[PDB]
Amino acid sequence: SVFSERTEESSAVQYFQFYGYLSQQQNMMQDYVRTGTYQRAILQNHTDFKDKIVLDVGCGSGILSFFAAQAGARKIYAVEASTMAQHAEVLVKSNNLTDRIVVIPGKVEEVSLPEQVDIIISEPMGYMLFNERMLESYLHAKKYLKPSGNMFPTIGDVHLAPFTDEQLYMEQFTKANFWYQPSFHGVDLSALRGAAVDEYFRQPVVDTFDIRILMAKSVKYTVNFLEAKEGDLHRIEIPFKFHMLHSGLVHGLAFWFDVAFIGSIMTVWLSTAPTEPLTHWYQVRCLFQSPLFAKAGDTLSGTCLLIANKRQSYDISIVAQVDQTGSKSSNLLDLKNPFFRYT
Amino acid sequence: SVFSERTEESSAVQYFQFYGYLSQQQNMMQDYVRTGTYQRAILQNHTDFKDKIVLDVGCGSGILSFFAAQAGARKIYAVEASTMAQHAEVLVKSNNLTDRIVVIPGKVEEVSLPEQVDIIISEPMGYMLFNERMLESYLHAKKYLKPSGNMFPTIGDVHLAPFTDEQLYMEQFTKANFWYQPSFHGVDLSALRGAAVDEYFRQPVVDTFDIRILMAKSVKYTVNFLEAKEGDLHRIEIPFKFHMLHSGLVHGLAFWFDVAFIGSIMTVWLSTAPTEPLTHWYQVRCLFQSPLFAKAGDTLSGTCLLIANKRQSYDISIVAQVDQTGSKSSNLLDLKNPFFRYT
Amino acid sequence: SVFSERTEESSAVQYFQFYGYLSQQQNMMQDYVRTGTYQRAILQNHTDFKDKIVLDVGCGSGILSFFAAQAGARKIYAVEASTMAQHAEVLVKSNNLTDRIVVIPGKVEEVSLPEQVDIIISEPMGYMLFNERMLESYLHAKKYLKPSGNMFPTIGDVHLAPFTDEQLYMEQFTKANFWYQPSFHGVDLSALRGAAVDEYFRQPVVDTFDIRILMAKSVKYTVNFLEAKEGDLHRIEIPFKFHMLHSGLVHGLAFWFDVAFIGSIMTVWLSTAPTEPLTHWYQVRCLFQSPLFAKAGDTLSGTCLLIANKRQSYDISIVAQVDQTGSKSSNLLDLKNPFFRYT
Amino acid sequence: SVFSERTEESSAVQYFQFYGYLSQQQNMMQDYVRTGTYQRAILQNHTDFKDKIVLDVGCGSGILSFFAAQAGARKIYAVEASTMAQHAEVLVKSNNLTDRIVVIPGKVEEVSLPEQVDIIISEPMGYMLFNERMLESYLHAKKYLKPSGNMFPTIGDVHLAPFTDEQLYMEQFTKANFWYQPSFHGVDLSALRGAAVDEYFRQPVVDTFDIRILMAKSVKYTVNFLEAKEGDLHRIEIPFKFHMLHSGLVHGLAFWFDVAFIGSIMTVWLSTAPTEPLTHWYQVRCLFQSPLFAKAGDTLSGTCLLIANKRQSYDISIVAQVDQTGSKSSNLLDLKNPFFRYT
Amino acid sequence: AARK
Amino acid sequence: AARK
Amino acid sequence: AARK
Amino acid sequence: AARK
Ligand SMILES: *C/C=C/[C@H]1O[C@@H](n2cnc3c(N)ncnc32)[C@H](O)[C@@H]1O
Ligand SMILES: *C/C=C/[C@H]1O[C@@H](n2cnc3c(N)ncnc32)[C@H](O)[C@@H]1O
Ligand SMILES: *C/C=C/[C@H]1O[C@@H](n2cnc3c(N)ncnc32)[C@H](O)[C@@H]1O
Ligand SMILES: *C/C=C/[C@H]1O[C@@H](n2cnc3c(N)ncnc32)[C@H](O)[C@@H]1O
């Protein structure tokens, strides 16, 4: 299938096992910004669901299917590849919705639907929006969508902005300098210090932060889920040209995302920006190997290239330079192995 | 290979990937109780290494091989299956021990050593001793051991004792009762209540505790690595009969382990008991879904049964009953997915 | 007959038996807030008593009739159905007030008075105001009241507000969880946990609490005793709409009451609010079996329905929902079997 | 029937309403001495139950029937008159004992049993053994017992002993002296002080105490349930002659009780004595109206006469004298209305 | 104490 | 608490 | 906590 | 700061 050719089976097994746990469902459900905004987006756009046919891609416990039923949907096909599908079926039975919600266990790329649907709903967003590569399954599901059907969420915006965080940067060497000692119990570890530094810098930092570390207004990359194709997510090139609002040392780029539910009645936004209440997506920061000095008015230009890999994530390549001085930096990061710094 | 036949490939990939990270090596090396005791056991039994052939199973960065070299070993074969083997070779060269430590990359069940060894050293202990199933690889390596050869560690003692900890029980119990809400955002979750409780209490709790919570003297199960065969660890049955020294609710069984290095000069112990300084193994507690009420002087009897699984861990079965009242508690736990509670 | 048609004989027997004890009379009389406020309301409104004809409904030991005499009443008919009427007549004689206070034993619904009265005094308030159903006898006694006569107390205000109290909730939850044991002395009680939770949470909790637990400004329901008909109290519907001032878990609704003595000189208030000094009425809290999560700014709306029963109390039904999420809670409580938690 | 002829219907409705609550069952079940001793008595005498027909009088939740089922009983008929019978048969079905435990709702005096039984089990003991008058129902149940059948418990011993408690005695007048004041809010209450004293002295005191207050060895009144007739409990004359072991003021008599389960294998005792751990029966104390001075070596003789009444309790008449001085006192108490002084 |  |  |  |  399209999923199998895209995914190492060892990665897929560990991925769907992770989502088989009720504790993981609970963690996402207790995110009030997340769950509450999805409910409002669906209920306040009730005409997009009243007497409609709905597909729920990756329904988990089925909470979005229940919101679609609260909004008056006639039939909801809830597809889930993890063992959580068994628990969703129990909830559909116990909530007396067997006539209106049909749980289909399996991958959306491999299951069969009895009919085309009017609207697709899903939560395909990972870290930095794209992590987990679930957006491809979401777009793949458009093969079940009627010609003028809708999608909830409809569009996604990824934001990038340069930041300064001297303490976060120096922290990488503090940790790596453990190896810079000539007699650890009699052993000289110093030859591995450089490898330790490289390892820490390859890790994106999943964390929240104060918005005053940002040094320029964000740049935005938009995906229209109604138009985008699966293949458009294999290689995501995000050029940027920041006009620096503040002078200082740029230590990397910060990432966040917003999705929009564009309904017939209204548009509802779900935002993970650092100016908004914290969600379980937090924000993501990728450090530069070498910081770049920039003064206010300067321009920091470069490219963030996301290359999809078969571990359901992306290799991140960031290149940046201060145009006025020519000093440049780069970094290669593995979005699959982030550092969860928040406490 | 013996390893491949007993391990799922998705789990083994995940496992050796985890141990390829220098940050993980640092975390173990910074445990001074662990590292200092290993060096003590090796240097103080230097006649066990002076001019001997040594096998180091799962050498990681190679620190135990360096200790064996400090003790005067003539040649040390350092086997490591993760990508850490290449970092170990870097340290061997930078420490000018290429004439004495030979890194052999691969799984110890699949490599070939050029000669038999006088002594095997390793750190095969996981959580609750048995997690990671590395003891089987350690015993498997005895095919390379000469008749009167030695093993470091030589024996392993698993201790178990009943504990009372109302706060811990209520923490896990409260988490599971999220799934009691009859109207989570207007959705009835209560049908999944029982499944949630089963999942949460399947998680062993890894952290430390004050010995005041122990309700009886520990029962100990001993594995003699010199005599045990690899297949002995497929099914581990630990019967127990506790003489309750205090009255109260028995919320589960606490586990820890000690290992002894039975050298020719002296025996050195490495202990993870709660009466001893904390190590990175901490201690492990298996909670009962429903605690047992016991009176001082009662006997708590039963069996702890560990069935080795294909995820390099064990399915744990704990059945315990208060003999004086017939009150019984049967529990299943998945050692591979624990709750890391320490902060 | 009006009384006997609405009360089961058995309950009426134990009710008037309870009030026949001098110990109980002392317990109410020692409440200085209660007794002092009544004397203040009567003495400071002496013009409502000077040379007036008074009816004291449920006079107990007669204290309120002595207050009316101190304020100058010409004649006081003190009616009391319990055996305490014998003791009241003893006090009337010993205090040399036989020319002013006439004890009439029996139920106010069954006795005969020689004349109409200018003012009625009574203490008809029970827990949550309405318990004991004595307000109906108080209103029934208006058949003896001259056209523009007064009533002391004149009006009654019931206040209700949502509260957070995890400790109280867990206290009752843990009690009910005794019936979750699968091996109590070898017996599985778990099938009865549902019935246990129902039984335990039907009990209103009578005690006092700090005002910090209230999550919204109280809603008030007013009964004007000058206008109300005794049948108005058979079915009391209290709709409510709370504007949540704090985020958190709503564990139930708290209740208290104030009564006003609206005399010709001044209005005197007797308050049982948690902001006021404690009285022997304390406060009343109805717990939800499952708390509702609410955010500050949300609206908690529903209906509190009190239906009178033949045990001189009320069946309480509380339906509440968080409007923003559709989260709903329905509860049934037995006001005559409360949990007296004060200690 | 026998029950209704001897019981006021109003007393009977409250009685069986009280035992219909799961919280009341829990209180008795949580009494470890009570529940644990009943279990041991039954299980340690397995030959009295194995393959036998058993009658459980007033089974409540059914715990004793499950113990009898644990002991190998062939068939158990569990009779219960309160609404707890519905909960008992829920447990019978839940423990897969529908084939061996038959729940018969109703009074043992009015239900029909199919077949005679080998042994009757029950917990008919109330305060000072006889309160609640359930021993008569227990004895009435012998109409279903096989000629040489057995009864568990087999015999009951009520113990009486003189005590000294100056503070308990003076405490009655301290409480009554509330009424001895000439201007309680302007009212002379003093004429009711004597009535208040009389009221307090009619109440037995249910609480525990230090055994150092007991002034002589107890005298014991024994009921053999295998021999006693129901009519033997209508008028229970307990003569006593205490050989005083201590000199001092005797303020009244303390009461407690033991029952014995006389099985074929062994005899097990359940004791509520103040020398034993506290049970939910506590102990009972009845004050004399005036204390008696006695020296060690004196004899304190008299009679405790228990007269059954229609409220499922006893009127207690105590007369006592110090033989060597002629000093005498007495009291008349209502066991239906005890004072619960414990905390 | 209280009123019941 | 106590029995009754 | 956070997703993944 | 634990093993695995
Ligand atoms: C972020 C949440 C993802 C949820 O969707 C499920 N899921 C991922 N990928 C698929 C495919 N291809 N088909 C069905 N369901 C999928 C995850 O298991 C999780 O519940
Ligand atoms: C707790 C430490 C484990 C170390 O040993 C290595 N390791 C595990 N299992 C094997 C096998 N079968 N062969 C070689 N090395 C092994 C881990 O990679 C880790 O360094
Ligand atoms: C809260 C105090 C109640 C007092 O009033 C007496 N009482 C209750 N109900 C009646 C009726 N219907 N008639 C006369 N007295 C009544 C209670 O006995 C208590 O003293
Ligand atoms: C102390 C516990 C008594 C239990 O026995 C029940 N009970 C009392 N009296 C009777 C009669 N005559 N028939 C059946 N069950 C009886 C109480 O209800 C309580 O459960």
Side-chain angles (χ1 to χ4, degrees), chain A residues 14 21-23 26 29-30 39 70 87 91 94-95 175 178-179 184-185 188 191 196 199-200 337, chain B residues 14 21-23 26 29-30 32 39 70 91 94-95 175 178-179 184-185 188 191-192 199-200 337:
Chain A
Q14 86 175 325
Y21 287 101
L22 289 161
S23 63
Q26 177 175 347
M29 301 167 64
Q30 294 201 291
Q39 183 178 37
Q70 290 176 6
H87 294 311
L91 286 189
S94 71
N95 278 263
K175 295 198 289 173
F178 161 83
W179 301 93
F184 174 85
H185 294 257
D188 185 352
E199 180 183 292
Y200 289 127
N337 183 38
Chain B
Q14 186 173 355
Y21 287 102
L22 290 164
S23 57
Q26 170 176 348
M29 300 165 70
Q30 291 219 255
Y32 178 56
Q39 189 174 37
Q70 291 164 8
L91 284 187
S94 62
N95 284 266
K175 280 172 212 187
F178 167 91
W179 297 93
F184 177 77
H185 284 264
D188 187 354
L192 290 178
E199 180 187 299
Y200 274 114
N337 166 42

Side-chain angles (χ1 to χ4, degrees), chain C residues 8-10 13-14 17 20-26 29-30 32 35-36 39 61 63 66-67 70 84 87-88 90-91 94-95 174-176 178-179 182 184-192 195-196 199-200 203 311 334 337, chain D residues 9-10 13-14 17 20-26 29-30 32 35-36 39 61 63 66-67 70 84 86-88 90-91 94-95 174-176 178-179 182 184-192 195-196 199-200 203 311 334 337:
Chain C
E8 221 188 338
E9 244 308 335
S10 147
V13 159
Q14 54 177 87
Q17 249 180 240
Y21 288 103
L22 287 163
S23 55
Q24 174 57 210
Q25 279 308 301
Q26 172 175 352
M29 290 162 74
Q30 291 183 138
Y32 182 61
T35 305
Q39 187 171 38
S61 65
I63 291 302
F66 290 111
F67 293 165
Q70 294 164 4
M84 189 60 49
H87 298 134
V90 167
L91 287 184
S94 64
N95 284 263
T174 298
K175 293 176 190 175
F178 168 92
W179 297 94
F184 176 79
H185 287 267
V187 183
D188 189 357
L189 318 171
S190 62
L192 287 182
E199 177 188 306
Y200 270 123
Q203 290 193 81
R311 312 201 226 261
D334 172 29
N337 174 231
Chain D
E9 251 316 309
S10 314
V13 51
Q14 175 34 302
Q17 150 165 51
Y21 285 100
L22 285 168
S23 58
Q24 180 54 213
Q25 284 299 311
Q26 179 175 345
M29 295 160 82
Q30 291 188 138
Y32 187 84
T35 304
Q39 185 181 31
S61 63
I63 180 80
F66 291 113
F67 293 162
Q70 278 172 20
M84 192 54 59
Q86 84 206 333
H87 295 135
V90 167
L91 288 186
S94 177
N95 286 255
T174 299
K175 296 199 291 179
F178 161 86
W179 301 94
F184 176 88
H185 295 257
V187 182
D188 187 347
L189 302 182
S190 58
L192 295 188
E199 184 178 289
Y200 290 124
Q203 285 192 286
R311 284 126 62 222
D334 183 18
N337 174 49

Side-chain angles (χ1 to χ4, degrees), chain B residues 270-288:
Chain B
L270 172 53
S271 173
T272 66
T275 51
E276 291 299 327
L278 191 62
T279 78
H280 78 284
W281 288 281
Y282 294 83
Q283 290 93 30
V284 188
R285 278 183 287 173
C286 305
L287 278 158
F288 298 155

Side-chain angles (χ1 to χ4, degrees), chain D residues 3 6 15-20 24-25 28 34 56-61 79-84 104-111 122-126 131-134 136-138 280-281 312, chain F residues 3:
Chain D
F3 183 97
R6 79 173 202 245
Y15 180 81
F16 291 116
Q17 150 165 51
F18 176 89
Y19 282 109
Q24 180 54 213
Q25 284 299 311
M28 305 183 288
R34 172 260 202 195
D56 185 0
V57 187
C59 65
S61 63
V79 178
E80 175 55 51
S82 81
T83 54
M84 192 54 59
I104 299 158
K107 309 182 175 52
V108 77
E109 294 93 342
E110 304 171 358
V111 301
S122 185
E123 184 192 53
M125 301 91 68
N131 193 44
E132 301 182 52
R133 290 185 72 180
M134 197 178 146
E136 291 161 59
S137 299
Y138 190 45
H280 79 286
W281 287 282
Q312 284 163 290
Chain F
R3 190 171 190 92

